[PDB]
Amino acid sequence: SASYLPSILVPTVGLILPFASMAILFIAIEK
Amino acid sequence: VLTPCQQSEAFHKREINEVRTLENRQANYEANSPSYLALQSQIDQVHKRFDKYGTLLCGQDGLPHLITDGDWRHAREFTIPALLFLYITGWIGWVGRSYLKYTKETKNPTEQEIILDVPMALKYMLSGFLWPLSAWQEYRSGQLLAKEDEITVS
Amino acid sequence: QLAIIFIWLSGMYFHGARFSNYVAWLSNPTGIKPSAQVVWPIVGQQILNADVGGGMQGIQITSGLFQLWRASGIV
Amino acid sequence: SIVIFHFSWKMQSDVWGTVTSNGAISHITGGNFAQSAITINGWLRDFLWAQASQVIQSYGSSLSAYGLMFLGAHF
Amino acid sequence: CAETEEKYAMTWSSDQQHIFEMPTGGAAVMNSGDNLLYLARKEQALALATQLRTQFKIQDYKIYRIFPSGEVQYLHPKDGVLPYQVNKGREQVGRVKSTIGKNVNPAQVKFTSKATYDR
Amino acid sequence: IKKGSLVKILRPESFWYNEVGTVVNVETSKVLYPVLVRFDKVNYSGLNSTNFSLDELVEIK
Amino acid sequence: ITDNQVFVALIMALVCGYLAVKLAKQL
Amino acid sequence: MNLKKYLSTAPVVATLWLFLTAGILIELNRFFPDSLFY
Amino acid sequence: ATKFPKFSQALASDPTTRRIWYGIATAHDFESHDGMTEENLYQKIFASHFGHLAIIFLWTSGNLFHVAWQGNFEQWVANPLKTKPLAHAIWDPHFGQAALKAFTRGDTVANISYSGVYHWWYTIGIRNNVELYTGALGLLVLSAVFLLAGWLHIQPKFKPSLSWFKNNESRLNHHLAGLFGVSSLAWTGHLVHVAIPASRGQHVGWDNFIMTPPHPAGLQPFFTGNWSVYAQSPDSMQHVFGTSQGAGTAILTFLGGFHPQTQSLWLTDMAHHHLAIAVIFIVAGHMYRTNFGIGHNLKTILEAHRPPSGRLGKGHIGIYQTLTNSLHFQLGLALASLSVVTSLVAQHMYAMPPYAYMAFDYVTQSALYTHHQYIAGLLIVGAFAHGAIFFIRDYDPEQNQDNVLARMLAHKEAVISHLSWVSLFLGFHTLGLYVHNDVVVAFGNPEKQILIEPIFAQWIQATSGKMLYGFQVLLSSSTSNASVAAQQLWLPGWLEAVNNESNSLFLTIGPGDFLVHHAIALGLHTTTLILVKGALDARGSKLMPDKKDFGYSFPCDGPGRGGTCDISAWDAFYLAMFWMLNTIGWVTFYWHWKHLSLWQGNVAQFNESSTYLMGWLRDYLWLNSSPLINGYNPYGMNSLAVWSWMFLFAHLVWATGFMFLISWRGYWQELIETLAWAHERTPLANLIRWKDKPVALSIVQARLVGLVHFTVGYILTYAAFVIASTAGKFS
Amino acid sequence: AHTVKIYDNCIGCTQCVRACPLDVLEMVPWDGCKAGQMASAPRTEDCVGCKRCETACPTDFLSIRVYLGGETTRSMGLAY
Ligand code: CLA
Ligand code: CLA
Ligand code: CLA
Ligand code: CLA
Ligand code: CLA
Numbered sequence A: 001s002a003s004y005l006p007s008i009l010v011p012t013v014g015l016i017l018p019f020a021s022m023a024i025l026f027i028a029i030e031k
Numbered sequence B: 001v002l003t004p005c006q007q008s009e010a011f012h013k014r015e016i017n018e019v020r021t022l023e024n025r026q027a028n029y030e031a032n033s034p035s036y037l038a039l040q041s042q043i044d045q046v047h048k049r050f051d052k053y054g055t056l057l058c059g060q061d062g063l064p065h066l067i068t069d070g071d072w073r074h075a076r077e078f079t080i081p082a083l084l085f086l087y088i089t090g091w092i093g094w095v096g097r098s099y100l101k102y103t104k105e106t107k108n109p110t111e112q113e114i115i116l117d118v119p120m121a122l123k124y125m126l127s128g129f130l131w132p133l134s135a136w137q138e139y140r141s142g143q144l145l146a147k148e149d150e151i152t153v154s
Numbered sequence C: 001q002l003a004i005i006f007i008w009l010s011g012m013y014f015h016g017a018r019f020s021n022y023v024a025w026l027s028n029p030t031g032i033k034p035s036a037q038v039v040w041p042i043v044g045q046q047i048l049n050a051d052v053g054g055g056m057q058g059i060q061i062t063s064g065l066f067q068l069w070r071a072s073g074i075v
Numbered sequence D: 001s002i003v004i005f006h007f008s009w010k011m012q013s014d015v016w017g018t019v020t021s022n023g024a025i026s027h028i029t030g031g032n033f034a035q036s037a038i039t040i041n042g043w044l045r046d047f048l049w050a051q052a053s054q055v056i057q058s059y060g061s062s063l064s065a066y067g068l069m070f071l072g073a074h075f
Numbered sequence E: 001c002a003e004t005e006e007k008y009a010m011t012w013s014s015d016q017q018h019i020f021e022m023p024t025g026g027a028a029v030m031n032s033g034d035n036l037l038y039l040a041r042k043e044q045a046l047a048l049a050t051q052l053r054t055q056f057k058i059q060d061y062k063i064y065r066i067f068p069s070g071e072v073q074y075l076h077p078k079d080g081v082l083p084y085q086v087n088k089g090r091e092q093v094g095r096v097k098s099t100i101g102k103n104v105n106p107a108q109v110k111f112t113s114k115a116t117y118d119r
Numbered sequence F: 001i002k003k004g005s006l007v008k009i010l011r012p013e014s015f016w017y018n019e020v021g022t023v024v025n026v027e028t029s030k031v032l033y034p035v036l037v038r039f040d041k042v043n044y045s046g047l048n049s050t051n052f053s054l055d056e057l058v059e060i061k
Numbered sequence G: 001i002t003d004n005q006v007f008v009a010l011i012m013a014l015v016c017g018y019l020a021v022k023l024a025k026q027l
Numbered sequence H: 001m002n003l004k005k006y007l008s009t010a011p012v013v014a015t016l017w018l019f020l021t022a023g024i025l026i027e028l029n030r031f032f033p034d035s036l037f038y
Numbered sequence I: 001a002t003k004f005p006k007f008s009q010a011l012a013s014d015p016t017t018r019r020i021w022y023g024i025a026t027a028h029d030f031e032s033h034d035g036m037t038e039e040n041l042y043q044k045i046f047a048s049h050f051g052h053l054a055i056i057f058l059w060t061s062g063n064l065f066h067v068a069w070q071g072n073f074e075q076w077v078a079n080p081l082k083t084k085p086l087a088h089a090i091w092d093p094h095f096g097q098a099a100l101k102a103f104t105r106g107d108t109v110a111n112i113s114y115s116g117v118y119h120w121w122y123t124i125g126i127r128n129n130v131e132l133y134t135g136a137l138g139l140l141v142l143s144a145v146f147l148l149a150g151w152l153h154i155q156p157k158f159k160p161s162l163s164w165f166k167n168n169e170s171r172l173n174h175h176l177a178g179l180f181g182v183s184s185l186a187w188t189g190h191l192v193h194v195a196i197p198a199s200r201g202q203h204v205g206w207d208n209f210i211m212t213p214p215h216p217a218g219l220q221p222f223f224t225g226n227w228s229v230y231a232q233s234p235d236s237m238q239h240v241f242g243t244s245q246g247a248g249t250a251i252l253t254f255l256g257g258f259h260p261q262t263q264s265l266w267l268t269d270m271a272h273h274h275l276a277i278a279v280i281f282i283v284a285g286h287m288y289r290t291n292f293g294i295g296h297n298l299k300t301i302l303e304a305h306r307p308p309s310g311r312l313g314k315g316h317i318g319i320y321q322t323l324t325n326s327l328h329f330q331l332g333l334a335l336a337s338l339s340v341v342t343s344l345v346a347q348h349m350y351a352m353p354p355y356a357y358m359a360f361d362y363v364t365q366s367a368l369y370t371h372h373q374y375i376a377g378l379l380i381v382g383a384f385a386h387g388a389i390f391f392i393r394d395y396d397p398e399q400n401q402d403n404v405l406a407r408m409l410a411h412k413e414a415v416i417s418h419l420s421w422v423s424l425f426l427g428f429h430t431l432g433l434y435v436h437n438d439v440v441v442a443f444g445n446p447e448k449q450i451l452i453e454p455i456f457a458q459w460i461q462a463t464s465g466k467m468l469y470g471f472q473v474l475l476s477s478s479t480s481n482a483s484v485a486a487q488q489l490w491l492p493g494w495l496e497a498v499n500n501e502s503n504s505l506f507l508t509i510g511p512g513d514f515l516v517h518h519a520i521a522l523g524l525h526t527t528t529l530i531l532v533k534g535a536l537d538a539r540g541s542k543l544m545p546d547k548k549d550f551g552y553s554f555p556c557d558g559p560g561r562g563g564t565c566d567i568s569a570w571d572a573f574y575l576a577m578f579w580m581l582n583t584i585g586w587v588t589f590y591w592h593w594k595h596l597s598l599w600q601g602n603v604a605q606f607n608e609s610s611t612y613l614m615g616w617l618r619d620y621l622w623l624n625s626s627p628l629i630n631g632y633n634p635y636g637m638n639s640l641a642v643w644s645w646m647f648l649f650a651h652l653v654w655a656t657g658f659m660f661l662i663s664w665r666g667y668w669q670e671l672i673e674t675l676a677w678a679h680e681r682t683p684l685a686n687l688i689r690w691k692d693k694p695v696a697l698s699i700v701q702a703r704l705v706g707l708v709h710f711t712v713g714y715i716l717t718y719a720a721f722v723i724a725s726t727a728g729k730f731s
Numbered sequence J: 001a002h003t004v005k006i007y008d009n010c011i012g013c014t015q016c017v018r019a020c021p022l023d024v025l026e027m028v029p030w031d032g033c034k035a036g037q038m039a040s041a042p043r044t045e046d047c048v049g050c051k052r053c054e055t056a057c058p059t060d061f062l063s064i065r066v067y068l069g070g071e072t073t074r075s076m077g078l079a080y
């Protein structure tokens, strides 16, 4: 049981994925 | 199982509990207080209340249930005020229909509905007493109904 | 409008007169809860007549009329 | 609604209530405002859940007409 | 703004210095001889045309639509007469042959780039 | 046909569809909807006074 | 309950993610 | 003269009938209270 | 195309923020795009179905992965009654210290899993975490397969013909035989080979199933019809589930009833069950013709059903055209049947609880019911909403010349008059009887109440053998025809399950059954009054008969002709969502206050205090929110602080709905202008100017987003209360 | 644009043009009615779609029926 993987995966999907998804979708308004 | 209510235990438990509970306020007054006489009348209206529910069916709850099958032993429970009620709003409905087919053919049907013509109103109020065999005989003439009234697209 | 208000205050003074326990309330106000309106005895609702003291029951005032009558000096 | 929900709960915690022997103090909720008004679960629980309990258990008594004008007003 | 949106400059004349109400709001000075009036959108302008015309005479009036390229337009009137009055120059567009009762059902229009009334 | 005749409609978007109505005016100058018919009851515009063509002109006797 | 099976899972849903974005920019 | 026309309108006769049948219910529930039979 | 909505240029021209919201909300309306033709629609939905099923199996592989990796599943298998089953773990960086001690169930701080998934995976026979990893990989594989098909059937050489989608004639022959019969028969291939031996102790993995038969003798002397051998040795009484002890070895015994110990259905009953349903569905698959041509042409199957009585139109002439060439009729029947299936499933997950040690965890049984009920009501409302989409954007009354649907639009005034009648009858006769009982109970008198025994449901329980009533009819009478007719087969194992009171099969009944079931029929007939109203006046009303022209969810007709707030066929969805949440509200409130009276034991607390409304608000909502609303104190907190925080949260959602539902647009359309002046005029920020222009939400959207916060607040509030309540009175 | 269509019920009573505060509607002499008039909507590029015309359209049912079409800057009526 890798007890360290949510310490990486929970923030990188919880906050930084709705940064780059805001960039991909919001610039994809104009792309 | 619906026990007959005059012998059910929790029923008479509610008898002792409500006569005693309402009786607890009755010792707050003297022998000739008006409130004390009022709670005398209220205790009378509880013993009469529980004796007049004798032939009902209170189950394990101690509360008198009803039956709506038309078993003819439960006819005073449901079906006698059922036929009674249907007579009363068949009265009301036939009065209102008969008055609208009055004011439909008058001078100005708009002013007829604000100001009810209490002559012709109280004509139809009382004349609509026998609506089964008067509404039924106006149904056999093909006149209770209508045909080819308003509708939308199809 | 003032006619409806004088009917209203004449109503409060009459419900204070005939129906209230204000005369008994004037004796011990901290024990007797103020009541004017004495509910007519129909099915059940006679239980709304709260035994608030004063020897006579009825539903309890919250409008505070008895305090304005003790202030105004109505005996 | 939140003016009177400030009034009827700060003054059931900080003003009203009774006094006992030796001038000792007793509020109705018992000082239960500043530890409980700061949240909403303290507000809804400790005010609207707890102060309702004398409106809700009011059946069979003279307070039951408020138990009818409570549900009918929710209606 | 004025560098990218169509400003509407309403030009009109009068006879006496009256006082009207702006669509932006409040009372306006209303120069008596001749006065232009920049606005923001057309309903303000023809609402001002109703504001003055239904009160009194303000004719020889029309907004010159300042589109941001620089030049003007002219709409109310175009042939010089009031629109609900009838002039013999206007060509009607926007009709069909009958009521809505003969308009086509939209399952006959489905998967086609048509209207529910052109037939 | 004539003025005063009691006329049922056969157009589905008439508000008074399959309801009789009285004829007020008929013009004989090839107007597409010449037969002005008003009614007892009232549509949602507040207005009983409408007009129709000749195909939707069905009288009673 | 183990370690490398979790990595096998995240690789297989990384491939599944590439097939999802492969479905994304064609419809 | 025209007061009886006002006493023939909709809300006034609505109160003089629902007041009356209201009195039928209340006067029929003082004389025979707790009536679940029949 | 070139703008945001890469599919319709009528919205890309709009420089406001309408292009965003309508660009999102019309992304899936494939019937109304710019140039998406008939073949290009079906070739898109056939790929997006693959994307959707890929999302289902990514979801189930998610549950397999978290139970495989963070749950306590096999620790729960060791002790099914004691240990509370864990969901996935937590990584909050917001839990300071005091919340971290409010979750410790083992080394992880995981959520208690309130979804019944360990019970289903424990009746399946997964007794490991390893099998859950192989299953989770086994559904990442399947989700990747469906995504690869979704890429595959949008590559242009493989995008199929529209006649292949109009091979409606054969989709039923393949679905009913294959998708139902073969998958169900294979599901007996899992029950017989896994769920029978792994419940009888025998751990039979993938390694040894091709060696150890589920019967000790099998299939070489068994094409002879000696089928009592397979149902020969039933597991009778003295068995604890999972173990090998106290158990027989028969495969397809139909005992009927429950386990005595785990209160679940027998897996022999289920193996025989899906085996029978498998055979009957395979028989159903051989129904219609194909390229072989032995079966039924569907055009002959509908047109021939025309009565010579002549009352029912010119028969079904046209209906086969307007199901193939239409879609929202087919989708309407699809959501209709799925919705009745979901409501049926909720009406049997509690009633005949299939899974071991359910009706023992009292929260997951209360989560599954309310789950499938709100999903059930959602799917009915969708079936009617695509009913109205069918009558607007899909209906042709010329191929339906005086057809059955045209007959339906003809007499629709009687249908709406009578749904309005029966709704008006029930709403004066639940609220009549509840305000009667509430007034009467309020005046110190529970006796003067109107209580009517619901005799008809008690009589039906007497036809299924509930002998606690004293009717003594077909199954409650042991001397009848049917009571003897299955005396050996499945009756005496089942009347133990009927006449027991602790189990949740054919519940004991007072007048709360009567009054509530009238309130539920009130909820149904009102909701179908809205839906059949705005699904048959969807096409044309006498206010405006142009409603077919403006599409489905146009906003209004303006203030003309009296005013026209919400005339569209989207008001059927819009209002029937509020009545849907009301009705499923009353259903699950009623169920939940029934089983909180069974599980606590005081059913007399229900039957005496549920026929008046302060019985509900007092005895259920005020009392049973006590462990909810104590979810965190100024003294501290516990494990239910998430459900009380979600509780207050969802009151905030449910009340932000009312900002959109009540207070409509033009307030905000003349207030966003003030904000836009305030940003255009301010310094240091008028540089930062918008590109999409700030515009208040149009009232097709406004009532939608108020509806969405109404549902999210409603459903999250009640999922907070079910789980916090039953998790507070127990565990 | 918000497509305004004016059908052949238009008996030319001109409450439509007087009711439109945008002058999308004008009257056209059309020899098919008693007034000889039938309304026209040439300038639907400025058409808001507020349906103030359809309120004041005293025909049988709405000779002038406004269909809500495109949404430009002018047709959305935004000030800025
Ligand atoms: C969904 C994922 C997510 C995650 C992982 C976090 C994580 C965190 N939040 Mg947070 N938050 C979130 C959503 C999330 N939030 C949302 C949705 C809201 C709005 C409701 C908030 C509102 C919020 C507030 C109001 C506050 C936090 C704070 C914090 C920090 C907790 C302080 C602590 O004890 O940690 C220990 C913290 C540390 C050791 C420092 C780590 C800080 C960052 C992550 C590292 C440095 C960043 C780096 C320089 C920039 C690189 C790029 C960056 C995007 C990673 C923590 C890093 C608190 C804070 O500001 O922390 C200081 C705080 O006051 N959050
Ligand atoms: C003239 C009296 C009259 C009559 C004979 C009817 C008859 C009918 N109505 Mg009804 N209705 C009436 C008045 C009347 N209505 C009034 C005044 C209203 C406005 C509140 C309604 C509102 C109404 C609705 C909303 C619905 C009906 C429906 C129906 C039908 C089913 C029966 C039912 O449940 O009634 C319903 C009864 C009520 C809602 C309450 C009764 C209304 C008043 C209180 C009593 C009427 C007495 C009348 C005022 C007396 C005036 C005349 C007198 C002074 C001379 C039935 C044909 C339903 C239908 O279409 O079913 C097919 C339906 O959905 N009605
Ligand atoms: C025998 C061959 C066969 C098989 C197995 C399938 C199978 C399938 N086809 Mg298909 N198809 C076939 C031949 C076949 N097709 C042919 C020949 C044609 C052309 C004529 C088509 C044309 C076609 C189209 C056009 C579409 C499909 C679709 C689908 C998928 C259905 C969607 C779904 O998941 O429902 C699965 C449903 C069930 C498994 C049963 C649900 C209902 C039961 C009664 C209730 C639940 C059962 C039980 C109680 C609950 C267990 C759950 C558990 C939690 C306890 C499914 C994978 C759809 C799809 O997804 O596209 C990719 C679709 O849009 N097919
Ligand atoms: C298998 C089920 C199914 C399928 C395939 C469809 C398919 C369709 N529906 Mg639909 N519908 C369904 C079920 C289904 N529906 C149900 C069950 C309901 C009742 C609730 C509806 C109600 C409904 C309406 C009212 C309409 C459709 C429409 C449509 C069509 C276009 C969809 C679209 O553009 O959405 C685009 C996609 C979105 C808008 C995204 C959905 C986001 C929603 C609004 C809220 C979800 C957000 C979530 C709650 C927030 C998360 C936060 C968390 C805290 C909860 C399409 C054919 C529309 C149509 O044909 O006319 C245009 C239409 O107007 N449907
Ligand atoms: C407390 C909330 C509440 C209540 C009681 C109702 C009740 C009703 N709605 Mg409803 N509705 C609600 C909220 C509510 N709605 C919400 C939030 C929405 C979303 C906007 C809708 C949307 C909606 C639609 C779309 C439809 C309904 C319809 C109906 C009626 C169904 C027929 C029926 O049962 O009549 C029984 C009658 C009642 C339950 C009325 C209550 C009894 C009253 C209070 C007694 C009479 C007055 C009393 C004597 C007090 C006098 C007052 C005093 C000033 C003198 C019923 C009146 C439908 C309809 O018209 O059906 C015919 C319909 O199509 N509703």
Ligand SMILES: CC1=C(/C=C/C(C)=C/C=C/C(C)=C/C=C/C=C(C)/C=C/C=C(C)/C=C/C2=C(C)CCCC2(C)C)C(C)(C)CCC1
Pocket (backbone or CB within 6 Å): I329, I332, I333, I335, I336, I340, I380, I383, I384, I386, I387, I388, I390, I535
């Ligand atoms: C609008 C629309 C629609 C609608 C929708 C829906 C939603 C529908 C409905 C439907 C539904 C929702 C369904 C229901 C069903 C019903 C039923 C189903 C009933 C019957 C019953 C039965 C069947 C039962 C009985 C029994 C028993 C009890 C036991 C014994 C045996 C038997 C089985 C007989 C449609 C699409 C159609 C069309 C188009 C339009």
Ligand code: SF4
Pocket (backbone or CB within 6 Å): J004, J019, J020, J021, J022, J024, J025, J047, J048, J049, J050, J051, J052, J053, J054, J066
């Ligand atoms: S649409 Fe709005 S603007 Fe164009 S005419 Fe009708 S009302 Fe006047």
